[PDB]
Amino acid sequence: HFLCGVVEGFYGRPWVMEQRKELFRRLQKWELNTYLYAPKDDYKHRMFWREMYSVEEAEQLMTLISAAREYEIEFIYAISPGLDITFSNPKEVSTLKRKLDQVSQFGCRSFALLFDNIDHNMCAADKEVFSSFAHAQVSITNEIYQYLGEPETFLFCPTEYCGTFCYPNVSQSPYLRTVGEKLLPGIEVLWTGPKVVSKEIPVESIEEVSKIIKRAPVIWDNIHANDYDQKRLFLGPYKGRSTELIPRLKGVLTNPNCEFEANYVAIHTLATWYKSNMLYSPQMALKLALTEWLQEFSVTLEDLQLLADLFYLPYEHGPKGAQMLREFQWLRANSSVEEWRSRAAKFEEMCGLVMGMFTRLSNCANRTILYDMYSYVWDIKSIMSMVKSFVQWLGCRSHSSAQFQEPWAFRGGLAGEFQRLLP
Amino acid sequence: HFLCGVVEGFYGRPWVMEQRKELFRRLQKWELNTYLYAPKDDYKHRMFWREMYSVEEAEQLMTLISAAREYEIEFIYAISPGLDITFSNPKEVSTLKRKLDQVSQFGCRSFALLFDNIDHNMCAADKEVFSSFAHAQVSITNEIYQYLGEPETFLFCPTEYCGTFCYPNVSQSPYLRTVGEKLLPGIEVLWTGPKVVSKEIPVESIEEVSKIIKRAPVIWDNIHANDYDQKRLFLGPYKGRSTELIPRLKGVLTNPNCEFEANYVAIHTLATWYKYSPQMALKLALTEWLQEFGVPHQYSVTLEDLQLLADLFYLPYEHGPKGAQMLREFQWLRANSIEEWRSRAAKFEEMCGLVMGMFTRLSNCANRTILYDMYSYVWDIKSIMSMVKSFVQWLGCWAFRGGLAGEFQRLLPIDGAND
Amino acid sequence: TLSP
Ligand SMILES: *[C@@H]1O[C@H](CO)[C@@H](O)[C@H](O)[C@H]1NC(C)=O
Ligand SMILES: *[C@@H]1O[C@H](CO)[C@@H](O)[C@H](O)[C@H]1NC(C)=O
Numbered sequence: 001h002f003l004c005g006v007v008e009g010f011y012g013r014p015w016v017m018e019q020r021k022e023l024f025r026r027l028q029k030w031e032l033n034t035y036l037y038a039p040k041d042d043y044k045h046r047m048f049w050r051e052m053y054s055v056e057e058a059e060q061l062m063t064l065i066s067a068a069r070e071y072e073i074e075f076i077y078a079i080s081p082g083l084d085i086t087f088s089n090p091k092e093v094s095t096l097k098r099k100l101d102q103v104s105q106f107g108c109r110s111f112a113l114l115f116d117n118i119d120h121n122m123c124a125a126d127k128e129v130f131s132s133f134a135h136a137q138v139s140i141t142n143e144i145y146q147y148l149g150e151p152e153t154f155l156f157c158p159t160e161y162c163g164t165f166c167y168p169n170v171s172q173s174p175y176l177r178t179v180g181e182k183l184l185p186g187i188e189v190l191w192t193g194p195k196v197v198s199k200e201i202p203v204e205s206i207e208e209v210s211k212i213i214k215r216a217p218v219i220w221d222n223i224h225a226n227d228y229d230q231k232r233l234f235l236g237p238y239k240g241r242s243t244e245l246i247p248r249l250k251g252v253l254t255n256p257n258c259e260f261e262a263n264y265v266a267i268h269t270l271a272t273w274y275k276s277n278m279l280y281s282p283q284m285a286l287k288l289a290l291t292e293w294l295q296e297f298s299v300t301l302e303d304l305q306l307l308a309d310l311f312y313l314p315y316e317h318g319p320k321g322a323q324m325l326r327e328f329q330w331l332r333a334n335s336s337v338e339e340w341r342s343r344a345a346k347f348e349e350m351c352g353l354v355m356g357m358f359t360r361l362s363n364c365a366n367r368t369i370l371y372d373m374y375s376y377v378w379d380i381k382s383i384m385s386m387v388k389s390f391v392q393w394l395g396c397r398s399h400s401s402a403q404f405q406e407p408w409a410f411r412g413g414l415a416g417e418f419q420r421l422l423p
Numbered sequence: 424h425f426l427c428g429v430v431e432g433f434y435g436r437p438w439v440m441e442q443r444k445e446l447f448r449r450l451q452k453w454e455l456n457t458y459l460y461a462p463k464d465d466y467k468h469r470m471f472w473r474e475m476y477s478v479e480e481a482e483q484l485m486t487l488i489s490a491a492r493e494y495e496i497e498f499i500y501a502i503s504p505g506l507d508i509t510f511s512n513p514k515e516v517s518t519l520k521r522k523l524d525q526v527s528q529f530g531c532r533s534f535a536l537l538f539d540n541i542d543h544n545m546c547a548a549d550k551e552v553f554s555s556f557a558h559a560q561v562s563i564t565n566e567i568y569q570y571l572g573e574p575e576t577f578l579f580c581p582t583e584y585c586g587t588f589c590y591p592n593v594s595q596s597p598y599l600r601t602v603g604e605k606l607l608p609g610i611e612v613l614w615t616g617p618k619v620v621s622k623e624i625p626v627e628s629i630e631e632v633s634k635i636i637k638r639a640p641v642i643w644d645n646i647h648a649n650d651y652d653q654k655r656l657f658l659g660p661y662k663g664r665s666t667e668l669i670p671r672l673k674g675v676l677t678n679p680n681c682e683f684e685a686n687y688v689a690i691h692t693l694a695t696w697y698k699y700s701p702q703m704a705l706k707l708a709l710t711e712w713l714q715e716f717g718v719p720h721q722y723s724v725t726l727e728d729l730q731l732l733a734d735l736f737y738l739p740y741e742h743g744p745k746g747a748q749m750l751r752e753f754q755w756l757r758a759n760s761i762e763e764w765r766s767r768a769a770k771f772e773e774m775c776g777l778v779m780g781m782f783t784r785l786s787n788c789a790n791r792t793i794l795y796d797m798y799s800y801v802w803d804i805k806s807i808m809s810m811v812k813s814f815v816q817w818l819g820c821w822a823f824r825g826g827l828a829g830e831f832q833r834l835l836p837i838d839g840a841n842d
Numbered sequence: 843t844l845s846p
Contacts, residue, residue, distance in 0.1 A: 011802065011844065013795040040844070041798070043719055047787055050723035083846050095723050117844045196843050228843070230803045231653055231825040258799075310827050317827055325830065332834060363470055371436040374464065375681075378434065379653045383828045390835055406587075407620050407739040410841040411832070412654040414735050414746050415803050418811050419824070420839050421757055783846055 003153065003251030004274045005032035005073065006267060007220060010227040012258045014039035017064050019260045024071040030271035035068065036155070036253050038078035038114055046080035046114075050095040052102055065107035076110040076155065077103050082118035087136035088129035096140065097147055104148070111148060112155035113141050114190075120159065120167075133159070134178035142184050155188040155218060163194035163205065171212050180214035188250055191217040197225065199315045200240030206248050219252040223314070224266040226257045233262055233376045236313035237269040237282035237289070246277040261372035264296075265289045265308060297364045303357040310354070310380050324350055331391060337398045344395050351388035354381055382408065426576070426674030427697045428457030428496070429690060430643055433650040435681050437462035440483055442683045444490045451494040453694035458491065459578070459643075459676050461501040461537060469503035473518050475525050485529040492530070499576055500526050501535035510549040510559050519563070520570055527571065534571065535578035535613070536564055543582065556582065557601030565607050573609060578641060580613035586628065587618050593628075594635050603636040611673050614640035620648065622740045623663040629671045641674035646738065647689040649680045656685055656800045659738035660701035660708065661692040669697075682796035687712045688733060705733060719789040728781040735778070735804050749774050753811060760818045768815055775812035778805055 005027050008015060015023070024035065037045070044051055053061060068075035079099065086092045100111060115137050122136060130136040141156055148154070158179060160166045166173045179189070191209055193201040201219070210216055223241075224234040234257055241252075254270050256263040268289040273280050290304045309318025317325065327347050334340055358381040364370060386409075393404055412419065428450055431438055438446070443458075450458065460468070467474055476484060491498035502522065509515050523534065538560050545559060553559035564579050571577075581602055583589040589596040602612065614632060616624040624642070633639055644664075647657040657680060664675070675697070679689040691708040692701070709729045716724045734743025742750065752771045756764065782805040788794055810821075825832060832838060 012798045041786070041791075041794070043787075043789075043791065048719060048721065051719070051721060052723075119845065227802075228806070229824065229826070230799050231828055232823075233826070315823065321827055325827070328831065328834065362464065367466055370464070374435045375653050378650075379828050382651075383831050386835060386837070387831055390837075404837055406618060408651045410838060411652050412838075413652070413656075414737075414742055414750070415654055415807050416838075417750060417842050418753065418807050420842060421753065422810065422814060 002246075002249075002278070003034040003074070003218060003253065004270075005034040005036075005253060006263075007036035007038055007253040007255050009036065009038040009040065009078075009220065009255045010225055010258050011040045012227050014042050015260050017060055020064060021067050023260070024067055024073050026267060027073050028071050030268055031275060032073070032267070032271055034074050034076065034251065034253060036076045036078060036112060038080070038112070040080075045078065046082070049079050049081045049084070050099065052099065058102075058106065061103070062106045069107065074110055074153070075108060076112050076153065077108050078112040078114050078155075078157075080114040080116070082115050082159075085140075086123060086125055087140055088126050093140060093143060096144065100144065100148065109151055110153045111144075111151060112157070112190075113137075113144065114157040115159050116157045116161050116190075118159060132174065132178060134175045135182070138179065138183045141187060145184055145187055150184075150186050153188065154186070155190055156183065157190040157220065161190060161220070162192040162196055162198070163209075164196070171208055173212065176212045180212050185215070189213050189215055189217045190220045190253075192220045192222055197222045197228075197314050198240070201242075201245065203242050203244050203248070206245060210248065216248055216250045218250045221252050221254045224254060224256040224263065226259070226262075231379065232314075233257060233259070233311040233373070234313060235262060235265045235308040235311050236316065236318065237265065237286040238273050239282040239313060239316075241273065243273065243277035243279050246274070259372035259376075261369045262376075264293045268292065296369065297366050299357070299360040299364055303360055306353060306357050307361075307377070311376060320350075328387060328391070331394070335394065337395065341395060344391050347391055348388050351384045351391075354384040424456075425669070425672075426457045426497070426641060426676065427693070428455045428459070428676055429686075430459035430461050430676040430678045432459065432461035432463065432501075432643065432678045433648055433681055434463045435650050437465040438683050440487050443487060446683075447491055447494040447496045449690060450496050453691060455690075455694050455697065456495065457497050457499065457674065457676060459499045459501055459535065461503070461535065463503070468501070469506065472502055472504045472522065475522060481529065484526065488526075488530045497533055497576060498531055499533040499535055499578065500531050501537050501578070501580075503537040503539075505538045505541040505560075505582075509546060510563060511552040512548070516563060516566065519567055523567065523571060532574060533576035534567075534574060535580065536560075536567065537580040537613075538582045539580050539584050539613075541582060555597060555601060557598040558605065561602060561606045564610065568607060568610055577610050578613055579606060579610055580643065584613060584643070585615040585617065585619050585621070586632075594631055596635065599632075599635050603638075612636055612638055612640045613643045613676075615643050615645055620645045620739050621663065624665075624668060626665060626667055626671065629668060633671070639671055639673045641676065642668075642672055644675055644677045647677060647679040647686065649682075654800075654803065655739075656680055656682070656736040656797065657738055658685060658688045658733045658736050659741065659743060660688060660705040661696045662701040662738060662741075664696070666696065666699050684790075684793040684796040687715070709733065715790055716785070716793065717789040718787055724781075724784040724788055727777075728784060731777060731781050732785075732801070736800060745774075753815070756815055756818070765819075768819060771815060772812055775808045778808040781805075 006023065040046055044053065065075050081096060121133060126136055145154055160173060160175050163170050166176060192198060194205055226232050226234055254266060256266045265286065269285040272285045272288065290308065291301060294301050294304055306320050309320040312318040331343060331347060358377055361370065361377060429446060463469055467476065488498050504519060543556050545556065549559060553562060568577050583596055583598045586593055589599060593599065615621060617628055646661065649655050649657055677689060677693050679686040688705065688708045692704040695704040695707060709726060713726050713729060731745055734745035737743035737746060756768060756771065782801050785794060785801055
């Protein structure tokens with residue numbers, strides 16, 4: 001009854017039904033049990049939440065919920081009336097119930113209300129019926145909970161959904177102090193850790209949150225989410241989460257890369273970590289995930305080794321990539337022209353391996369995988385070309401004065417220009 | 424007749440069929456006529472160009488080419504074998520023929536062979552059979568031409584395909600002299616201009632190229648191509664190419680943004696040109712696009728926004744007015760940190776506010792296809808302007824940004840040579 | 843993350 005798997009909860013292009021089916025197959029292939037549907041930019045999930053699914057949309061949602069049972073993965077349907085709704089208006093409540101009614105007849109048993117990412121105070125009308133902001137959300141959550149006959153699993157994502165998002169601090173919050181106390185115990189609470197993207201979740205921090213929440217929370221985990229940075233992708237192991245945590249949480253749902261095929265390592269390494277304590281080593285999980293991924297693709301394990309190292313984790317590059325960095329850092333500092341030449345050549349080779357990994361990746365069989373990742377790898381290949389080129393220039397300079405134009409030499413457009421003027 | 428349209432000729436994910444066929448609708452609506460199939464990373468065009476289509480892929484392709492004819496758009500199939508082809512071995516030249524024939528039976532009458540972005544050295548076997556690299560590509564090009572009955576449209580993209588790529592210059596290029604004379608009369612040559620991305624395509628330069636190849640070339644235009652920088656999108660007007668080039672060329676095919684929906688200005692303005700003020704052509708193109716961005720129908724984006732969007736993602740060598748302006752305003756403010764500054768800080772926060780504004784409305788439009796194609800771009804600009812809005816106020820009263828690439832990138836002094 |  002412990003929930004572990006994926007939440008499709010990012011901003012941007014959501015997945016299509018053919019990706020979400022391929023998602024389920026993988027989930028039980030590796031023994032995870034849950035899927036939360038909360039893609040921020042499906043218009044009907046959040047942006048136009050009162051609105052009924054169309055006839056072609058109904059067909060699609062039913063086929064999906066079907067495949068969920070066909071794979072015995074539990075399907076949770078989220079909705080997000082956060083920024084819009086009038087809590088104290090009962091037609092507003094009715095439309096909310098009408099909407100959830102529509103989805104239950106698609107085959108759907110598990111439900112969730114999300115109140116992440118919205119303005120901290122209500123309209124003139126709301127200031128009356130409810131004493132505080134936190135009071136208003138619970139009213140409808142509970143009113144809803146019961147309406148569905150108090151279903152199997154029903155999640156609640158708070159406005160203050162992580163440590164830094166708790167005012168003034170985490171255990172001194174009127175908001176979270178209200179929620180714990182006035183929210184039904186048949187209802188789950190989502191939490192993302194100390195931050196939105198958490199480098200690590202200490203066992204202590206959950207005990208602390210669990211006491212103000214008066215439950216064991218389900219983690220919405222942003223460790224592999226890439227929606228907040230165009231250049232960024234994350235193929236590292238599930239890391240910074242103690243196996244010690246499984247006893248203290250009702251689940252973990254991973255919010256992963258927008259690009260579906262990139263999420264292989266993300267979901268697999270999460271799978272093993274949960275298999276561990278239902279300790280665990282990231283450096284090995286990755287070794288398991290990467291060899292098995294290599295099946296699906298020409299490209300070597302060494303190539304993927306390099307690939308995940310270049311696109312590792314939101315606060316950590318991978319071994320081969322950290323090394324390539326400090327190396328280029330030393331080389332540019334020490335600019336004598338003893339050993340310096342020795343290390344230029346060694347670096348220049350390490351560059352050619354990126355060019356290598358890119359080539360064999362493009363020549364590969366599995367075209368869906370290539371595409372989800374193409375721009376991410378083309379970018380790294382091109383910067384490493386300039387970086388090889390630049391080290392080349394720095395060596396061939398005791399014998400030249402030639403100072404260091406197509407557009408891809410200066411980069412990032414207008415965004416890049418503003419970015420470079422920031423301290 | 425003069426060829427004007429799009430070439431799907433970029434690296435990365437290729438457009439799908441339901442997108443291509445929508446392209447065919449738009450080409451026709453705007454009185455354009457050509458579409459060159461050359462997507463570099465569509466398997467069986469380049470990488471493994473030897474493999475014939477399946478029973479399923481035949482269904483898809485035949486269906487597509489059919490649709491191209493339905494809308495009076497000339498379909499040109501193109502093939503990039505130059506990666507690993509052995510010129511002399513006729514198991515190969517047969518395979519070329521064999522593949523070509525197959526698509527011919529999908530109802531296809533026009534073709535191109537492409538030799539851009541390949542090594543100047545052949546294998547030992549071909550070093551014997553053929554005189555120079557030039558001589559070699561010619562040989563196979565003509566034979567394939569005749570093999571298909573000397574077809575109505577047949578294109579050859581060379582290896583030295585722009586000013587910069589010719590040894591040592593264009594008019595005295597061994598490679599180009601050969602193609603000029605020994606590539607057949609009825610076959611046309613693709614050309615990108617001075618540069619791979621030509622900021623301008625001067626008239627003098629087309630004269631210079633035409634002399635040494637003895638035809639007017641077909642322009643493969645990369646003005647709006649964006650495949651080559653993750654952060655870059657070009658929704659600016661067609662620019663830098665005088666209408667006086669038209670009599671001096673057999674075509675212009677634009678190789679435009681990877682994200683399909685984003686190519687509305689790119690393509691509309693090219694049509695406009697083909698019949699010129701780029702500022703006027705943007706206005707016509709923006710005003711028409713606006714009708715494709717509705718709000719969804721409910722049972723329970725302004726022109727000024729598009730103008731701002733275009734100005735932030737405009738052209739490769741040029742920011743659009745509002746982009747240029749905000750950049751100058753923020754540059755002055757970072758400099759000057761009597762009180763006139765506060766009044767121009769106040770105006771700048773409102774400008775930023777319009778970036779967030781534009782992102783928000785775009786987020787509610789019914790046309791989700793369009794929104795998605797441009798999402799991560801519009802997001803980035805919005806996130807950065809929020810921070811720039813903010814940091815301007817740090818004066819009044821994300822350390823892993825870009826990941827590894829961004830980190831390496833900040834250590835090369837060469838960036839920030841466009842600010 | 844986000845607001846409007
Ligand atoms: C060279 O560069 C452009 C832009 O990066 C790329 O899209 C195009 O496919 C390549 N070939 C030609 C003929 O431009
Ligand atoms: C806030 O930020 C994360 C990462 O960008 C975004 O994916 C997520 O949907 C938003 N809400 C929550 C609960 O994470």
